[PDB]
Design a protein around this ligand. Structure first.
Ligand SMILES: Nc1ncnc2c1ncn2[C@@H]1O[C@H](COP(=O)(O)OP(=O)(O)OP(=O)(O)O)[C@@H](O)[C@H]1O
Ligand SMILES: Nc1ncnc2c1ncn2[C@@H]1O[C@H](COP(=O)(O)OP(=O)(O)O)[C@@H](O)[C@H]1O
Ligand SMILES: [Mg+2]
Ligand SMILES: [Mg+2]
Lengths: 477, 466, 81, 35, 456
């Protein structure tokens, strides 16, 4: 019966020409006799071109293709938290099947103008440089762009681990469920990442979608949309989600493979004409909703890898045109030990300023201004600018897998911007920072608790801070 | 007339008609959809089959699905009832405020105004932006183009122009959002509601919004600019009104045309673009014009792919404009904002008989000294500053002061810069630049001219630095 | 253009070699104006090396683009038959 | 890459040409006076 | 299933089957030839026709000539009997020493290990080479880029890695000559015979060789890396070893894939590379990993086209590399062997969380003092002379005598454990040997041998 069932005519180049399937819809999931799945791409007068989600080795000429009647969708819900799935929603962690009750199409259009509201509440990364200078809000699209091995995945992982302090509490408003989409990475890297999230107890609120380097190009193309659907579930049911696409460069390369194998006209760098639409329709789905639509959000942290620091290339500029700002990571800084190697003159957050808390604003306006002066200078005043800027740049450094609470960042930046560190020599800034942070955590949980509950620094808290920092700097090496 | 779908490839749909083949550009309605899926006839393929471009997503289309012919192209509501409302590419309201109850409808495909309707008058339009007003001034009823790569400030500049011109404007205004961020459209909507330019309670609204954004399939992104054109053309012709048309971004029209041209079966041109890029752009751009029936001052942001000004799309747009503001990434990395390239921005009213000999001489002298600095750049880069003449050192110092003084804080940029915006009158701009060229401030440091308004603020900042 | 970039690369490589030799010659003749010339030629060589690095990046980028463009022309010519 | 500074026609290729003509126009005036 | 040739265009052959179409990646056997000709299925063209790529020359092929379906991908002999032998891409011996009498055969096309078979924390692979183990250590199941070609002792370092991983870890090696020059393949075979790594008389051979020559069609050169990887996969999955796999060269693997893709009519991507460049590289490299049975560590010689590191072939290879060993001629002409450049060799596991704070700090100190010494050389004070002295001593102590060079040089080879390396460089950095002459560190193993040479 050639109306719900077809036979493969040709296979190769990742596309299977199927004869029959007369009632198949465009963009519908089909199921091959081998157990593989595909998507109806080209409905033609005499055949159906099917994008195979897997290896062409498993599909032969003459194989039976049945249609599932459903436009391509993935399982969504709370039942995916803690699971590692592939681009189709099948669990690859061996913990059994996903018990999901709801499915959601992967190519749903982003919300319109009316369902949205401005980004107002903060998405805390726990990274001092980000949380202070490039603040991210819930519903934003912030790009993490840089060369290879500059610390991009580390920023994303620190954010995910940071969300634990909110996901363990009772404030349901302030929770954030994370989705990590691995696209074209090494499988061992994703396994080690999932272990890092399991040690930090960050997997219980994280979904990992894995389309690695050995997976077929259609799977690496589909993975970001599957992850985005899993996040749109939370965004549309009143909750808040964060999604990392690591990275969209390899997804664009997978899509270019698929497009060149379909014999479509290449453009700049042999990329198809719709490589911008590929990322735009995806990153538009990260939105902050107004309260008549639940009030939830979906934050996107796409990752892009540049070649020799070239950020004016085709795909980098496309994504810069799509997102709400970018966090540049430089190799020249990363080699010099400044880590996270965030370029502060080039990174920006267009809509995150309205999300920064009041305390962090109080310290970060001054920090940002002093850093701008230190940049614009590099006698007896410019020397003070240089000294303050150097102290601040050592204050911005941070370690891996240890994100900080917002009040601790506020305390450290406070010590930095009022001028207490001008006494120490730059090589001692990190020593002072760690010792002082441990001191304030141990014996001053009341001031930190007050700053955290108040969201700002009152003159009472400002006085207590000045007292504590003067005493510590007095009794310090 | 009713046809049936025979092929669906992306945004392109083939429809075979037994009776009554619909003309090219007619709008077709697909039957059996939850929402309105409009197909626009693009080609007659032969054997009673047409090839169409879908204005929405084609997922769920089955071969054999019925399609009705409307008998006319896409018709949108035009009139004063569209003011304060948001409509999409096919004229449907997307602001949840009910139907747009206009008394007429106009097809989005129309002929360009004839040669005998053109208007030649070229009065200036002062914007309050120092570099624009000085070096490449805009003209009322003219076509303005803002070129720039990704993240150089096209949206910031166009929002500054909406703030500086459209509120002070006496006529109507149309903002066509073409293939841009949806959250930017939400921001613009709500900003116009608070600033009173859009009124949700009565009929005093002064702006009509048309949005097909970067989440839309390529057919909607290719025709939403035409929908905005149609609204502005109604205001210009049947009302005789002075119209302000802001298009951000107009490059997405060409990019969407390229995306669909892939599938319409056409041999690609240079850089993979459609072979019809220039004639499509011309058909669209010739309707955005001032006739002797009414005026349209048009501001268009043109995206520059990979910062390549020689790309076919911006290179083709260059010929359609009276004033071009070319933003530069290299200038934006020097902290100078707006990132206008002063030796790449032009205007046709930069003419002594139009702006006066004082304005013209100041602008030409500024450009001369900036070109001389650019010529010295290599020697300055390798052999250092000290291997120059004294006249070359004076040229470098004055050129750097002028570079700084071309920057300016915007009122739309206050939120992420803290500096209050400045609106500098044309007299004060000409005076300040005449004075810097004269040498009246060769003693002040260059960093005193950075991010100020008039030259008095420059001397105040110099006095506060020392 | 690839030929413009190659011209400029060649020119700046020559400038870098000349300033390096001049720095060595001033270092020999210095064993107050000789010290200034030595440091100045050292700085000129360093700046020339940085311009050489940026232009080498630009040149590799432009040659990759030229190869891709010529391939696309050949492919599009073959696909129209 | 010999003579590639002058062949690139930059601010350095113009500086070089101006030098060769200035030095050899002064020499030619000093060589024609004696001649 | 029997088919018949319907088209022969160069190295591409179309074969039509009247029953039982073979899947993609199956090997086919052309009948009636004096030498074995193998075709690998690439596409199903429809109408019972498959398109294949030849593994050997196609001259003399006739339309209608019978072709047999093998029923599986290319199968090669895998086992301890492949050690010391040479086989080509389809597994037959090319050293004229008789058949390779293994008990089982493995298909050269295999899926990478699953997600739950992956090791979840990175460990170090100790090679016994001081500069490598200290400054740019190798990870088990990682990929290492070997930069530098002729005149810097690449073959000596390869053979020493083979010997040291055989002694320290008990893991065999596999060498894949992807696009190998036949002259240099003969040279390598005989240097391996003379250094004892290959033994033609008993079963103590440590390495297996797989040669895809330069005069073979692009399909053979695109599959020889998979053949070598299949031998190494056997040694890992069936004997739980830590295997070494050498891919010389990896750029030629990319080049052969590009040529095969162009032969199949596919539209080239950027710079002329196959559109499937990243996925070809990925399907090869993902099989090089640490599983729960064992691991496969891969040293891969990198060639960079036009010295352009942003070229698609290096840029795609570098995404998989876990380390880098740069063999510099400026180090060899300086007298140091192995000629590893200690400042340009990198590692991803040079991280305190992976190698330990002590290792990280010793390595960082060595690198900082070497950079300082380069700076000080550029200007040729008070303690800068002491920095110069300690850095000269560190430079000398990075050298090491190899066992595979014993018959030629006479010096005994040294396999320095990791702790001895760490503590020796730590002591030299602290100043515990600021009295010993700088030539007491040249070509020694542990630091005790340095003090013993200083005695004399
Ligand atoms: N803030 C940091 N402090 C110290 N070390 C860091 C920091 N961030 C990253 N690193 C180190 O640099 C290494 C590379 O970082 P990371 O993998 O996160 O960046 P990447 O850009 O994603 O690399 P890749 O291109 O392979 O994806 C990390 O293994 C880590 O050891
Ligand atoms: N006039 C300006 N002043 C200060 N910063 C600016 C200005 N214009 C642009 N920018 C910077 O560029 C960023 C984005 O510019 P944008 O308006 O989005 O241009 P585009 O639409 O071309 O991407 C702004 O968030 C800001 O950081
Ligand atoms: Mg990463
Ligand atoms: Mg914009």
């Amino acid at each position: 019966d050639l109306e719900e069932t077809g036979r493969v005519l040709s296979i190769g180049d990742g596309i299977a020409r199927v004869h029959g399937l007369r009632n198949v819809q465009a963009e519908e999931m089909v199921e091959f006799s081998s157990g593989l799945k595909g998507m109806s791409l080209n409905l033609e007068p005499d055949n159906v071109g099917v994008v195979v989600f897997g290896n062409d080795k498993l599909i032969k000429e003459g194989d039976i293709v049945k249609r599932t009647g459903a436009i391509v969708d993935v399982p969504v819900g709370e039942e995916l938290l803690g699971r590692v799935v592939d681009a189709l929603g099948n669990a690859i962690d061996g913990k059994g099947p996903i018990g999901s009750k709801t499915r959601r199409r992967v190519g749903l259009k982003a919300p319109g103008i009316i369902p949205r509201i401005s980004v107002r509440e903060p998405m805390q990364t726990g990274i001092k440089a980000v949380d202070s200078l490039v603040p991210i809000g819930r519903g934003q699209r912030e790009l993490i762009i840089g060369d290879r091995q500059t610390g991009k995945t580390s920023i994303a992982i620190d954010t995910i681990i940071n969300q634990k302090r909110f996901n363990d509490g009772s404030d349901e408003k302030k929770k954030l469920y994370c989705i990590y989409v691995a696209i074209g990475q090494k499988r061992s890297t994703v396994a080690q990442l999932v272990k890092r999230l399991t040690d930090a107890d960050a997997m219980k609120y994280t979904i990992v979608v894995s389309a690695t380097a050995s997976d077929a190009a259609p799977l690496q193309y589909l993975a970001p949309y599957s992850g985005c659907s899993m996040g749109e579930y939370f965004r549309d049911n009143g909750k808040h989600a964060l999604i990392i696409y690591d990275d969209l460069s390899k997804q664009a390369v997978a899509y270019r493979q698929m497009s060149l194998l379909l014999r479509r006209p290449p453009g700049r760098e042999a990329y198809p004409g719709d490589v911008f639409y590929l990322h735009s329709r995806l990153l538009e789905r990260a939105a902050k909703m107004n309260d008549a639509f639940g009030g939830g959000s979906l934050t996107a942290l796409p990752v892009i890898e540049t070649q020799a620091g070239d950020v004016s290339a085709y795909i980098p500029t496309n994504v810069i045109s799509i997102t709400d700002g970018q966090i540049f990571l430089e190799t020249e800084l990363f080699y010099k030990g400044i880590r996270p190697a965030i370029n502060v003159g080039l990174s920006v957050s267009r809509v995150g300023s309205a999300a920064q808390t009041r305390a962090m604003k109080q310290v970060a306006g001054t920090m940002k201004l002093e850093l701008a002066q230190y940049r614009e200078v590099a006698d007896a005043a410019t020397q003070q600018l240089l000294s303050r800027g150097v102290r601040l740049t050592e204050l911005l450094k941070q370690g891996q897998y240890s994100p900080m609470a917002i009040e601790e960042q506020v305390a450290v930046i406070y010590a930095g911007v009022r001028g207490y560190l001008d006494k120490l020599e730059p090589s001692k800034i990190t020593k002072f920072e760690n010792a002082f942070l441990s001191h304030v955590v141990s014996q001053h949980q009341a001031l930190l608790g007050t700053i955290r509950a108040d969201g700002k620094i009152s003159e009472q808290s400002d006085a207590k801070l000045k007292e504590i920092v003067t005493n510590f700097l007095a009794g310090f090496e | 007339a009713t046809g049936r779908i025979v092929a669906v490839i992306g945004a392109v749909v083939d429809v075979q008609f037994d009776e009554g083949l619909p003309p090219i550009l007619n709008a077709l309605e697909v039957q059996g959809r939850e929402t309105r899926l409009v197909l626009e006839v693009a080609q007659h393929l032969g054997e009673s089959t047409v090839r169409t471009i879908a204005m929405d997503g084609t997922e769920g289309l089955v071969r054999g699905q019925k399609v009705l012919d409307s008998g006319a192209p896409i018709k949108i509501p035009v009139g004063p009832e569209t003011l304060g409302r948001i409509m999409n590419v096919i004229g449907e309201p997307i602001d949840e405020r009910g139907p747009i109850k206009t008394k007429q409808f106009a097809p989005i495909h129309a002929e360009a105004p004839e040669f005998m309707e053109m208007s030649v008058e070229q009065e200036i339009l002062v914007t309050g932006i120092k570099v624009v007003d000085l070096l490449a001034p805009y003209a009322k009823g003219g076509k303005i183009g803002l070129f720039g790569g990704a993240g150089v400030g096209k949206t910031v500049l166009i929002m500054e122009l909406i703030n500086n011109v459209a509120k002070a404007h006496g006529g109507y205004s149309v903002f066509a959002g073409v293939g841009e961020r949806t959250r930017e459209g939400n921001d613009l909507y709500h900003e116009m509601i608070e600033s009173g330019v859009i009124n949700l309670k009565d009929a005093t609204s002064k702006v009509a919004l048309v949005y097909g954004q970067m989440n839309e399939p390529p057919g909607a992104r290719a025709r939403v600019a035409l929908t905005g054109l149609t609204v502005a053309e109604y205001f210009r012709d049947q009302e005789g009104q002075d119209v302000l048309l802001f298009i951000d971004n107009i490059f997405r029209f060409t990019q969407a045309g390229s995306e669909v041209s892939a599938l319409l079966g056409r041999i690609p041109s240079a850089v993979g673009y459609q072979p019809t890029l220039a004639t499509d752009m011309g058909t669209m751009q010739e309707r955005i014009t001032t006739t002797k029936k009414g005026s349209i001052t048009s501001v268009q942001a043109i995206y520059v792919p990979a910062d390549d000004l020689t790309d076919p799309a911006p290179a083709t747009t260059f010929a359609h404009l009276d004033a071009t503001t070319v933003l530069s990434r290299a200038i934006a990395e020097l902290g100078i904002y707006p990132a206008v390239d002063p030796l790449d921005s032009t205007s046709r009213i930069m003419d002594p008989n139009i702006v006066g000999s004082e304005h013209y001489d100041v602008a030409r002298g500024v450009q001369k000294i900036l070109q001389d600095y650019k010529s010295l750049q290599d020697i300055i880069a390798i052999l250092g500053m000290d291997e120059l003449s004294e006249e070359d050192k004076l040229t470098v110092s004055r050129a750097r002061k002028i570079q700084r003084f071309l920057s300016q804080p915007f009122q739309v940029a206050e939120v992420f810069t803290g500096h209050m915006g400045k609106l500098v009158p044309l007299k004060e701009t000409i005076k300040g630049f005449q004075q810097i060229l004269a040498g009246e401030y060769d003693h002040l440091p260059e960093q005193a001219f950075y991010m100020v308004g008039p030259i008095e603020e420059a001397v105040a900042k110099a006095d506060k630095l020392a | 253009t690839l030929k413009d970039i190659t011209r400029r690369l060649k020119s700046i490589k020559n400038i870098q070699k000349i300033t390096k030799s001049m720095k060595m010659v001033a270092a020999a003749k210095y064993a107050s104006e000789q010290s200034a010339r030595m440091t100045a030629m050292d700085n000129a060589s360093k700046n020339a090396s940085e311009m050489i690095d940026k232009l080498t990046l630009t040149f590799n980028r432009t040659r990759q683009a030229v190869i891709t463009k010529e391939l696309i022309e050949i492919i599009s010519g073959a696909a129209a038959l | 890459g010999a003579g590639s500074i002058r062949e690139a026609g930059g601010a350095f290729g113009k500086r070089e040409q101006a030098e060769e003509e200035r030095y050899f126009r002064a020499q030619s005036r000093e060589q024609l006076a004696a001649l």
